[PDB]
Structures are given as C-alpha cells and as structure tokens.
Amino acid sequence: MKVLEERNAFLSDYEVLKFLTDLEKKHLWDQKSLAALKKSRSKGKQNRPYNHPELQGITRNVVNYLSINKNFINEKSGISKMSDESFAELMTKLNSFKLFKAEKLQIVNQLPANMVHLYSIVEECDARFDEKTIEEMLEIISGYA
Amino acid sequence: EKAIPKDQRATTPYMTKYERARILGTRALQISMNAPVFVDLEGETDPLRIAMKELAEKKIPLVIRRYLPDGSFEDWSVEELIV
Amino acid sequence: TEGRSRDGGLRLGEMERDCVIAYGASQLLLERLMISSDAFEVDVCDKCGLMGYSGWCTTCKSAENIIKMTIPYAAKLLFQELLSMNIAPRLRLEDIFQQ
Amino acid sequence: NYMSNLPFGLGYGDVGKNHITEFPSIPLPINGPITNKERSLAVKYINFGKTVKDGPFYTGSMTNDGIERYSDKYLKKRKIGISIDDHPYNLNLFPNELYNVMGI
Amino acid sequence: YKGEVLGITRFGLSKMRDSVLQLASFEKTTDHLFDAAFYMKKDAVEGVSECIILGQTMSIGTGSFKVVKGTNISEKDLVPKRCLFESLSNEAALKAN
Amino acid sequence: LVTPEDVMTISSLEQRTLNPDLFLYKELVKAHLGERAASVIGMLVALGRLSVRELVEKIDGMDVDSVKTTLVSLTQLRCVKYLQETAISGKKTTYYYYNEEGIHILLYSGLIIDEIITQMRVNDEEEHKQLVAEIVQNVISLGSLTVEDYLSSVTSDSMKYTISSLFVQLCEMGYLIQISKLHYTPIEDLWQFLYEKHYKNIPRNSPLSDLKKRSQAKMNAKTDFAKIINKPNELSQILTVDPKTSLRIVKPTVSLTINLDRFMKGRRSKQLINLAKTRVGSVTAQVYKIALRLTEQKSPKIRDPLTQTGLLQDLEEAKSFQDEAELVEEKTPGLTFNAIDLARHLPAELDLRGSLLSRKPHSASLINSHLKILASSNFPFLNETKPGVYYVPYSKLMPVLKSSVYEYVIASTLGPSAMRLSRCIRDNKLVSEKIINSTALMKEKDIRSTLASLIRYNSVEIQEVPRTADRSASRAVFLFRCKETHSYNFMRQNLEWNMANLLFKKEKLKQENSTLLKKANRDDVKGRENELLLPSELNQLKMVNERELNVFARLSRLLSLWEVFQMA
Amino acid sequence: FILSKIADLVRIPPDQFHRDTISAITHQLNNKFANKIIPNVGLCITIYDLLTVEEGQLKPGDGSSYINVTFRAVVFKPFLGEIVTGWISKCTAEGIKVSLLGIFDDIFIPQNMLFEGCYYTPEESAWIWPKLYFDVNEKIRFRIEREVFVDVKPKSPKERELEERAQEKPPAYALLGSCQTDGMGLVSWWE
Amino acid sequence: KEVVVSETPKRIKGLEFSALSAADIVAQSEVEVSTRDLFDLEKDRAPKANGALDPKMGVSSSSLECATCHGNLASCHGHFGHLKLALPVFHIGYFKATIQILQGICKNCSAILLSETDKRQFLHELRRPGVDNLRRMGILKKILDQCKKQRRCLHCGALNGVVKKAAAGAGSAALKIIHDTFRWVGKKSAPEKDIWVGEWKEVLAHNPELERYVKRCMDDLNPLKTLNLFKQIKSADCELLGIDATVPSGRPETYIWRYLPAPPVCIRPSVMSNEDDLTVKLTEIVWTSSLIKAGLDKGISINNMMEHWDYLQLTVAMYINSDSVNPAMLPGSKPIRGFCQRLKGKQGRFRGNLSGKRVDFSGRTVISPDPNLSIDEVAVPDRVAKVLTYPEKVTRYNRHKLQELIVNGPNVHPGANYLLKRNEDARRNLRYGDRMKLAKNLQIGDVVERHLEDGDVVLFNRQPSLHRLSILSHYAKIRPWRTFRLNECVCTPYNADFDGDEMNLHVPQTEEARAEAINLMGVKNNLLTPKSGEPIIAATQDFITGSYLISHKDSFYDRATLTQLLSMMS
DNA sequence: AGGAGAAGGAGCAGAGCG
DNA sequence: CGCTCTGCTCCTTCTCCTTTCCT
Ligand SMILES: [Mg+2]
Ligand SMILES: [Zn+2]
Ligand SMILES: [Zn+2]
Ligand SMILES: [Zn+2]
C-alpha cells in the first residue's frame, strides 16, 4: 500500500489521450456502439469486457476534455488528432529555442497562436527573449493546426 | 528469508500426508467458490471429489513452500512431489 | 447452551483437542473450536493493544489505527476481564503476507 | 448488610455519594502579580532558550520539488546553514568515539 | 534437555515454556498472569495452546508449510513503456549548459 | 458533570503519572535543544548508563550518526558525562551518563546572569553591564569558551582590554573556572578508581590487617581525591600569568566554563539574608548582608563536598564528615572575621546612628552591637570563636533554614492550625491525641481534620501500637511523628514536578501559537507588528507573551522555594 | 498528469482464475484506484503499466491468490507553472468556483488574487471593474498558487448518531490559484 | 472526495503484559461510578445516571440501549467505567511484589540497596543476548538477596531491617507490612536507636500503660506511606526490580489501587431481577469510599477512620479474589465468585471455555452394529440427518442438484433447510415462502444448507479419549432407524461394546476441515496404532470363529455351496 | 488428605578483633 | 581470647491440586 515514488517522468498531455483512446477502442467504444449493436459474448448478453462504470466515466470525461478545443482560441483541440510523428519531429524547434526549463509539455497543448498567451506561458518571457524567438515559436507550435 | 535455489534443494522429494490433505482442502475450497477445473468431470458435483480426481491426474496448479527453522524456504510443485 | 432439554451442543474437550492435535489437523481445530462454537469480530487498535468498538479506539480518540479481525468470544471476554483487574494484555499485530 | 455501619461524625445524608474533585484547589503564594525585577528576569530568560535554539547545537528535527524553472534561479536562499564541524572543539573534552562526526 | 532433570509437574513446566498463556491454561492461572503483569512478560504466540486461545493457525501438521499459487505470468510483458516521449524533456538543455 | 473525556483535556491527569526527574529534565532539554536531545536524555535518565550501540538499539532512531551528533551537542552543553573503560578480556567500551549539574544551568540560566550582573557592581557604568551580560550569555549558550575566541568574535582595532579586563575580573571572583576531565567523569567512579591503586600497592601479606588495609586505602585515597577536586575550583595560576608590558591576563589556551558551586553558595547567602530579615531589624540584617558576601568566595561547598556521592556513607562514620565540616567552617582563616573587618566594606548609605537603644560614623562599636544581636538571636546566624571573633555555623544553620522554610510553606498552603500542629508534634516526640489536645489547646475535631489534611503529604507519620496478636485497628492506639527526612523528600519532588508542569504548559502554548510568530519573524517582530494591522493578532501576541512572562516569574519563585530542600 | 510508482496487495477471487493474471490484476487495481484521490499525491486516473508481480500466496481460509504488485498509475496533479481552462458554473459571495469538465470542481480561486479591479456585486451584477466582467458558463483561464489537502474524519459514533439525528468538507483535494497577469480571465477577451 | 481505502490482513504476533497507569484507566472510561443506588426508581427501576448499572456501560437484556453505541445485548461490545478511591489501597495480585519492592530499596530516601559496580554487574547479567525466564528469575532473586544483605543506605546511611509482612491470619491483618529496623543492630549504639528511645521516653511518662507494648510497634508501611515512597524510586534502578521503566506505567507506583476500572455490564449481566457479586461488591466499594471521604473532613476519630480504611482494603481484596478464610471480620457475614474464581478450576475460563468449548452441528445417540456397513462408513439416522445440514455453495457444478434440494424442502430427507443469498445477510428459512420460485432464482454464489446425505464426511467419537484413535472420520450413510451404526471391525479403536454405549458425531462445516478430516483421520488411513505400529482394526470374535470354522481341515464344499458362499461374501 | 514449594526463624562453626 | 558479626544449615508453618463427561 506504500507509495514508492512520488513522481516518475512527466506524463505530458500527449500520451494521456492515446492511452485512453486505445482503452476505449479495446472496450466500450461509443463511436459505433450507439447504433444499437447487440453482440453476444460469453452468452450473457453483456457482449463487452470491463463493464466497469467508474473507469468508463472518468475516461470519457478526460477524452471529452481533450477533444474539446484547446482553449487558446474561442473545432478540435489540436492535440486529440495529433499525429505521433508530429510530436517527435516538432521537438526540434522547441529544443533549439533553449527556454532552460521543462515547459516543453506546457506549450504542446496550451496557448499557441497568441502573443499574450505566449508571454504568460512563462515568467518574464519578454525579458528573457524578445527579438526573434517569440514569432518563431508561435509559427511553429501553431503551424500544426 | 531468501529462497533456496532450484539447483540445490535438500528436502525430501516425497509428498507428505499433511501436504496432501492441505492441497486437497485448498483446491476443494477453490472449486466450491466457482473456479475452473482441468479434468473431464463425468458426473460429479462435489468439489472435494473433483479435487481428488485432479490430484490423481496430476493437474492441480499449486506449489508448496517449505519453511526451514532458520527462515529460508524452498518451492516444490504438485507435479514434482511424488507419492 | 449445555442443557439436556435445550439445543445443547456437544462438548469437544481437552482430551479431544489433544487427539485432533496429534493427527496434525490445523484447519479442523480452527473450524471446531472457533468457527462453529463462538466466532466474533472485534476491532483492535494498532498502536495500543486494546480492543475498540465500531471502528473507534476509545483510548486514543483517533479511529485511524483500527484493524478488524475474528477471535473467539471467550478470548474477547477474557481480555475484558483481564483489563478489569490491573492487567493490560496489549495485542501486537503483524502482516500475514509480505513474505 | 454493609450499610449498617456509620461513624459518629457522619450521618446518612452525608455518606452514600463518592465525590473526589480531581481538580486542584489549594494554590501557592507564588502566583501573585508580577514585579519589575521578575519582569526583566523573564526578558533575559526569553533571550536565553532562544539564542541556544538559533545557535549551532540544535539536534532538534527527528516545496523542494524536482521541477526546475527560473523561479529556483536567483531565488533568495532562506538561510546560511551551520554544522557541528564549524564550532571549535577542545579535543580532550570529547571521547575518541565521536571524532568522526565532527570535522577533524 | 536443559541441563538438569526437570519433571512433568507445574514447577518443572516452568522449564522452557516461557509462555504465560499456556502456563495459565495448565495451572496456577492467576499467579502466572499477575507475575506476567508485574515483570511485563512479553511472550510470543507460537505454541499450540496460544494458537487455540486466539483462534490462530497452528504451526505443526498441516500448518507447517505455505501453499502458493504460481501466477503463470510472462516476464517480457512487464517492461516500462512510453512511446515517442523522451525526445524533449532531458534534451531541452543538453547543450550550452 | 465533567465527563472523563473532558478530564483528559482540561485536568493534568495525563502528566500526573510521569516521573518528576524524567519529566523536568526531558522538558528542559526539549525546550533548549530539541527532540533528539530529549530522546537521548530521557533514555539515559530512564535506564541509566548506556553505550552508543545500546542507545541505537533502544531509541527508535537507529542512525548511529544521529546519536553521535546528539551526544557531541549534549557534551558541549555538558549535560552528559562519559567513562571510557577498558575490559581486561579485550576491547574497551565507553559509557555515558546524565549530568545533573549540566541541566541545572539551563534550569538556572536567568538567575545566573542576574547574579553575575549584580555582583560585578557595574551599576555605575552602562557599557560594563552589557559587556558582562554578553560574556555570560555567550559562555552559557556555547558550553565552553576561550578568551581568544571571544576576542576574535569582536571587531578588530578596538580596545580589547575593555572586553578582557573584566574577563580576568570574572575569573578572580570564582564565577568562571577552566574545564577538565573531572567535570565529565562520575564522582563515584573516580572514587572507585582512587580507592584501588591504594589497596593494590599494599605489600603482600603485610603485617597490617585486612580492616587496617582497607582503612589505610581509604585515608590514603581521600587526600588524592581532595587534591584533584580542589585543583580546578581554586587555582588562579591561569590568571596569575602576565605577558610583558601587559596587565594581569588569563592564559589564551585554557577553556572556561561557569562555576555552578559559586552560584549555589551565592544562593545560600541570599536565602540566609532573607530568613534573617524575619528575626531582627533591617539595620542588623543590613550588616549581615555584607558579612555573608565577604565570606562567600571562600565559603564551603554547599550541596556536598562530593564525598557523599563518592561511596557508601560509612559503617557508622559520617561523623568523620560532620566533624570535618565543623573544622573547616570554623578554622578557615578567611571565614573567621572580627568587628573591625566589617567597617571598611560597610555601605555608604547606612548610618547606624540611632538604630540602637542602650539601656531600657561607621564606628566599630556599632558593628559589635549588631553582631552580638545576631549571636543572641535564636537562629545561630553567627557564632563567636573568641570575644570579638565571628563566623557563620553552616552545620547548624542549614537545618533551621530548611525547617523554617518548610513550616512556612505549610502555613501558606494548609492552615495556620496545621502549622501549629506540625510544630507541636515536631517539638514533642511521639505525641498521642489526648496530649495533642492538652498542649495545643484546639478542638479535637479540627485537630483531626488538619491531621488528615497533613498526612496526605509525607508530613505526619502514624505509629501504630497494637494490643492484640492480630493487629486490629479497633484495639490499637495510634501515635504520631514528623520524620523530617520524609517531609523534605516529598516537598522537593512536588516542587520539581510543578516546575516541569509549568515548562510543559509554556511549550504547549508556544506550539499552539507559533502561527503568529511566523509572521512576527517575517515582519521583524520587535516594534513593527503594530504596522501590520491585524489587531486580533496583536492582542493574541500580547496575551501569549503575558502568559510567558508569568510562567517565568512563577518558575523563578519555585526555584527559590525548592533551593533550600535541594540543599543537604 | 504525472506517473507514480505504488506497491500494494491485490486479492484475486477464484471466479477470475480463468482470466489472464495481468487482466485480473489490472481489474482489481482499477477497482481500487478508479477516480479516487490518493492522499498527498493527487487524484489517480488510470493504471498505466505493471512492473513487478510476486507469486500469489494463500491464507488458511480464503482460497484466493494474494499478490504483491508494483505499478505506475496516471495521476492528475499540477503544481505551479500550469495553466488550466474551463467554464464557471456556481458563484457565491465568498470567492469564485470554476469547474472542470466532469472530473472535479473542488478548485477554489479567490477573488482577492483575481486581477486587481474586481469586487462582488450583490445587485445580481456578475462582477465590477473600474472595465469588463465575466459571468456564468463562459471560458476562463487561471493558475494554482498552492495546493492543499484535508483528510479529517474523527467522528465518534455518538457524533455520527447526533449528526444523523440532526440531518461539511466535500473536497479532499482542494486547489487555490490567482488571476493576476493579463491573459487569464478569458481568452476571448481579445482577437 | 472518495478517498482511497485499504484493508490488509493482519495476524496476532504476541501478547505484551503490563498494568494500567491510572491515566489509562481514565482514558478507558465513559462514565464515573459515583452513587450507590443501582436504580433511581423514578422510572420503574430505570438505572441511575452514575451508578453501578449505568446504561453507558452496556445493557443486560435485548430490550434496551447502551447510550454509548446504541445497540442491544447483541451488537454492544461493552464499555468501561472508572471508580476513584478516597484513600490508596493495596492490590492483592501485586501484594508480594510490593513486599519485594520494599525489601530492595531504602525506606528513607528510596535508593536501591546495591553498589554501583554490583548493580552494573547485575545489569550486565540481565541483558545477556540469550536469557530466558529461568535465568532472569535467578538473577533477580540474587539481586534480592544482595540488597537484603546490605545494612546501611550508600546514599543516606540510614538503617534497614527485615521488611516482612505482618503475618497474623488469612483474613485479619494479612495485608499489613512491618519493617523491623532494629533487628540487625545488636550490642551496638546507633543514632536511630537513640532517637527511638528518646521518642519512646516521652510517651511512657504521659501514658504508663504502653510499657507492656514497648516491644513490637515496628515501622508499619500503610498503603499511603508506601505509595509516597514508590513515587520517589528513581527510573534508572527499575530494571533491577523487575520493571521496564522505558514505557509510561512502567513504574512501581502503578501497582497500588488508586482507580478501579468499572467492568462492562456484558461481563456482569443482570439475570431475570437479580444482580451479581461483582456489581454488589463495587456498590459496597463506592459506599465505603464515600464514607471515608465524608468523614475525613468532619474530623472523625482516627481510631475509627483507620478501622474503615482497613475494611475497604479487604473489600477490594475479596472482589479480586475470594481468600478471606475468616469472613467474621465482615460484620455482615466463602462461596462468592470473584474475578479469580472466574478463571480457575476445571470449569473456569481456560479449561471450560477457551481450551475446549461446545460446538454446533453435533449429535449423540446409542450405537448399534452393522456388518454390511463397510468399515470407513457410519450409518446416520434420517431424523438426525434432516437437522445436521452442510452448507453447500452454488458453484456451476451443483446448481441443478441444489435447486432440486430446495424444491424438496425440509420435509423430505433429500432436501434443504435454509437459504443465504450473496448480497443479503440473514438466512431465509425454507419452511415457508414458495420455494419453487426460490429454486428458479438461485444464483451462482449463494449457500444452501442441505440435509446430510450419503458420502458426507463426519467425525465420530467415544469418551474418554485416551489415544488419538478415539476419534475417526467416517462416511455418512442415511438409514431408517434411530441409532448410530458402525462395522464391528472398527470397534477396537473406540473401545465400544454395544451394551448401551453412546457416541458423538460432528459435521465439519468447511471444505478445508472436511478434507483434512477425511485425509488424516479416515479409518482406512488409521488401521495401525502409532504406539507400536501393529494393526488395531481387524476381525472380532464371530468374524474370527466363522473364518476358523470355514478354513478348518474338515470342510469340503461342492460347487453349489462354493458359489453361494462367494456370492454371500460379495 | 498427600505432596512438594516457599517464606521466615534458630542454633552454630567460622573468621576477625582489641 | 571470649567476644561479636556474617553466614550457612535445619527446621516449622502455609497454601495449591488433584478424570470421561452425558445431553
Ligand atoms: Mg460399554
Ligand atoms: Zn489505541
Ligand atoms: Zn455500546
Ligand atoms: Zn536512604
């Protein structure tokens, strides 16, 4: 019952969508089961593994939240439909612009495409750099959507 | 606390009466609480007799942990111990 | 009860439990001497070895170190009588599992 | 009947009820008002007991997160620590066993 | 077995039993319990008498070994995993500092 | 009604079980050092002498390192002793003790600073007061100190003489001694070491008998013990040295500590003055105030010559200590004094002119009158060697001081009828109830009530006398005694417990109210907390500080109360 | 979101022996840690992986396999340098409570740290600025300054009985933030 | 909200014995027993608010409520009270321990009568890594002899004599301790003796009758004086006495009666009313304590007050153990049942209710023979087989047979008696309720309590149980008569002789108990006695004489006789 | 009962003494 | 050299514990 490690590697808001989407794909996918599917499995009429209500509800709420538009703008999120290669190949500009932090996860999902949003993403963002590496980050991290 | 390795084990390889009775009782409990079995049933309802049949056919999925007085132990299965 | 008229249970005495020990039968002793005679659930504190009630310590008013377990009702009664003199039989608990 | 007994100075009305206050009732004359001398004595007592606790010989203890940003940088350090090694120790007064923990 | 001839009486039975519960179960119950209270005798519950009194499982016979059920679980499907992840965090400042 | 649950919170029945010695020492070290020091000190006091591995095995903390750090801190504060002994069969195992006199410095710190400030007579110069206060504060708060460390702990290019000339003045008055291994060594163990090596170098099969050999070892180790004990107490060779073209300056290398014995002697002088003020005039006691201060520096040791703790008392020969005490207290040349000596040190304010009525300029004939008054008083305040010679008989004045303080505590707590009955039974011996009525003239019902209220403490003992073979309480006649030793024993434990309780209450209050002291530390508590608004916070700070000051005042009064019983 | 590492004891009933060992371990783990707060680490969401599984041990009366297992779960716990959106539902004159999307609404962002020119209008007016205000069911942004926990439950049985006769701590996971810098409040303020 | 919760199984590891420190006794209470009236009578014998039967400590019947955790005689575990005493009194369980503590310490300063090196050696001997009770008792006794040998306190130089207890009788003056200070000083002059004679000179002058009683009058240790001495014993020397001073209540002062815990009413229930001895005795305790408290402030006679204080001693002494052989000291007055009497004897707690009990699912009737009964089998009457159910859990392999048993119902022998669903708690009696639909709605996790059938494992027993073959596990066989039947071959292990002999039957109620019974105590597995290894189950008188007559040399059989004999054999 | 255990006495060689 | 301690060794008085239970 003991908690061993308080925090492992930061599970950024990129895999927290893929894992939940795969879980829903494996059991209780509602994108096509709403058509009145009546597949019988194990002879009980349940026809689904893991009827578990609590996990299904919370995973639906997380997938719904990450499917709603990422709220840097007022219609997808920009992370729900993120190609896997994109996360591994848009890393180049983020790493080249040495922010000197671990806020790479902060930008990949929240507040691209604005100046005030990028400014409030990090502290004294104007003071640290205001010459060329604000518009570059905006045009890179906003170029996905 | 540690486990005596498989290559060097110094205990008897003959199953004992106590080990046999405990194995049968535990398996009977497991079956009576609706566990899958691994022998052709024929016509039988008793978990005890199903367990006896499984033991005779050598198909019980349990292992025995033997505790020496110092505190180490060895692991013997039911398909290894003989009678 | 023990009446000839009531549903008087049959006594499994000292000699009989000695025979059953000699056969080496532990679970049968458990069944015949606790389960089918007087099995009682109790709550015991883990920092002090004292039985509580309803998940409450009633000696260190916490309800945070309470553990449930089954003991003979005669054992419960003996512990309460021992506390009624100036004897405090503190019970120490250990985990069954964890190797 | 165990209720027949009764002392002379006691009537039936007084006995039959066990009541021990269990709260103290006889004070000491030392809890009067304060005096200026005792006031200044308390002030120096307060300065003591405080100076030692803020001193090196404490041995008292029986969000430091891992995330790194610029807030951690140029952050005013709360305190400049001290150790057992700092204070000058006369080696004769201490047994040999304890030399390892002190800075030789 | 303890270097001297100890009988099978109550006085002899204080040989190596060291168990207040079973000594009280046998004879001179209150004397033993009061002595255990005074000297703070701190016995362990390992003897068969204490096992019965507390309704625990004996350590002899069928209670002298442990039954264990093999989990039958492979080993290569227990590796840690995170897909296309570690490109950013550590390497964000792996140069110029 | 009050339920048992409410009892455990309001009333102190939880603390009524704790031992007074363990409670007070543990609370003191927890207040001044912390939780690890309290753990180690509590384990030492509860179990006794222990080693480091035993300390690790006992205390939950199994980190030897933590134990070693706690032990070095406790040794620097000299709250512990050590005895590094070697076993003949092999290796050597050190051992640790709890220092009674080390903790009593924490228990007496404010009083110690008070005495050092007042005795230097630096009331004239302000900076002198701050200087001596800082010296004594730093010494007590650091354990041991050197003049080199103190001088390097000041800004350079200054007048080091101003901060060093009083240091030698401190060392010359006995308020500062050098520290050696005898301070960290048990007295009885030292006596055991010295008693041998004198019973071992005896010739084999010597003509002297075994009793004669043991006696020879006793009186041949007593001299070495006395030499070793008196060495650090009074040997001014450290301050006697003098570097060229310089003043009398102490040796840099020697490390200094407080001298608890001198402070205890000063406390005894204060108690004697305050008790004398209750039997003679203020003018007579004014001279007694300076008579006691003159002989204070050379006064005999107060609690013990360290020789009662050193061994078995004797077969019957504590008379060999009583006689030596009388011999020292009289035949000390400093202790003996005449009416001429008191003239010079007499206060300037005192006049002595009209204080005396014969038949019903600081003249020596005035002093002799008051000293004769002191000798004539029922309390042996002074005694005369020869007509004109004077000395204070401590061997006979301490029992009367103890008995008077005890009976006045009884008067202030229980009834004046209780005081009268206690003195009646003490003056008498084995007095029966009828005789109590006869020689006390008080109603028997009231006498019985007060006797019962007095037996709840170890003040009146009952001596049964049975008239039948079976000691029935109907056929027996009951007597009474006083048993002064039991009564003083109970009185000191009660006061010690109450001091422990007060310190515990203060710590609890600070624990509950540290939430404001945090903001106080944030905003520079001294004088600025008004500017931070929060009038509720300021009022709470005010009443908690008032409670703290009251706690300290009551603590000091309790100290003065138990001092006399702590004597022997 | 972060990843943890927790050891535990998991009991597998004989009914589920037919299933895969990992497929039953994950099921009991999900039962235990479905949508619940683990004290002093945050609110767990979902078991992510499984790293250590001991051999199942049986006690003398149950017949089930008791297994020690260590795993890495998915937990929601931002610290300081975070930014979370959402919409506000319920407001009261003690501060403003903004909601998530059906995960938890136990976050309380005070009015005093909300920008500068804001105050509570009891005239049914949403807010006041000295020059724009938000209202219910509109997009917002904020931060968290300090995260607090509460785990108190010392209810004696008599206290339980009296409470039941007469009939608060909903949140065991409470967060507090601020809205000082421009950019928060609402993203549709601009553009 | 919805925090995680955990439940880890736990095992008993060991008992640890001590005494309660009079702060634990108060932490242990819900009320204080102040009055002497059991019932207020203003509400028809409703118990008093602060009396011996105060409802806060539980209820004695099932029609009431316990006012702490509201529950009847069933669901209420029980709660304690406390009972403060006006004057300290001895604890008869710890009386000799109090004597032993006194004999080892100084009676003036309460320092242990040992030397620092001597006590260091004893301490080293006590803490040796391998030391058991026998070695510890030996070392402690040696310490006792050494301190009894010491003559003068090393700290205060006082005088210490023998500290025996005043021995006058079992009941009267038994709990009195006398210190004989001047026993070891003979032909010597000591300050203690001089002070003694100086004290005694005054009394005789005023009272010339005590000249006869000049002797005796030892230093008596009353409970209050003894308590005040024990509060000063240092902690560092508690180990040498037999006390662990590391923990609170590890103290010699906690073995003196100053608070009496008031037992739960569960322990002392009110029968159908009539009270019991424990409650009566504690009412008497409250009575005498209140008398002492009221009289102390009234200045009642010291001779009178000490006579009551001695009476309160014997009252709490007889409530812990009935040992006042001469009860004539009690004006009201040894068959009373104290706490000690509730644990001793053949019929006490240990030998009557803990190591040996009375069990459910058992029967007893006369035995009869049955040759056609196989050995390994016992024949059970149908009448007792219809009441001795075995609880069979529904498990996907017996659902059909279980619902057939439910349909048959308790009336027929192949039937069931109770039903217990998974989610529900109480058992549904099958004597009523249209068992036809219950059998249809039977699910795969319920438990059916069905009659004893052919093949069920049971235990069989005869008394007295000399060797282990007095109880053997058989197989059941339902039969039309009333006796228990067994094959005459297995009569030898029981020592049975069908002359009116009765035997006991037990039906194990769990799978594990069943399997161990049949696999370890089964007749086929116990054909050989373990005292020699020789057969014990074999032929008997007629089974032997018939075999001999068959195999005699004079016996010749044709084919018809041969084949009939073989058919009879099978 | 019998049957050992245990706590207090009572005389006694021993060993040191001036 | 009797005397006088310190210590055995011997002895007397004082409680505990006695079988299957059979409902
Ligand atoms: Mg017969
Ligand atoms: Zn507790
Ligand atoms: Zn209750
Ligand atoms: Zn003493």
Numbering used by the authors:
A (entry chain D): 1 to 74, 91 to 161
B (entry chain F): 71 to 153
C (entry chain B): 1051 to 1149
D (entry chain Q): 14 to 75, 101 to 142
E (entry chain A): 1364 to 1460
F (entry chain O): 25 to 384, 447 to 654
G (entry chain G): 2 to 131, 137 to 173, 189 to 212
H (entry chain A): 2 to 273, 280 to 340, 348 to 584
Verbatim from the authors:
The yeast Ty1 retrotransposon integrates upstream of genes transcribed by RNA polymerase III (Pol III). Pol III transcribes short genes encoding for untranslated RNAs such as transfer RNAs (tRNA), the 5S ribosomal RNA (rRNA) and the U6 spliceosomal RNA. We report cryo-EM structures of Pol III in complex with IN1, revealing a 16-residue segment at the IN1 C-terminus that contacts Pol III subunits AC40 and AC19, an interaction that we validate by in vivo mutational analysis.
Interestingly, IN1 is capable of interacting with this Pol III-DNA complex as with free Pol III, suggesting that the interaction may occur at the periphery of this multi-protein enzyme. This preparation was employed to obtain the cryo-EM structure of the Pol III-DNA complex bound to IN1 at 3.1 Å resolution. Additionally, residues R698 and Y701 in C128 switch their conformation to allow access of the C11 acidic loop, comprising residues 88-93 that are involved in RNA cleavage, into the active site (inset). Strikingly, focused classification of the Pol III-DNA bound to IN1 dataset showed that virtually all particles contain C11-Ct in the pore. In the structure of Pol III-DNA bound to IN1, the Pol III bridge helix presents a straight conformation, associated to a conformational change in the nearby C11 acidic loop, while the trigger loop is fully ordered and retracted. In yeast Pol II, an equivalent configuration with a straight bridge helix and a locked trigger loop has been observed in the reactivated intermediate of backtracking complexed with TFIIS30. In our structures, the C11 N-terminal Zn-ribbon (C11-Nt) is located between the C160 jaw, the C128 lobe and subunit C37, in an equivalent position to that observed in our Pol III-DNA structure and reported structures in the absence of IN112. We were able to model the entire C11 linker (residues 37-63) when C11-Ct is ordered, independent of the presence of nucleic acids.
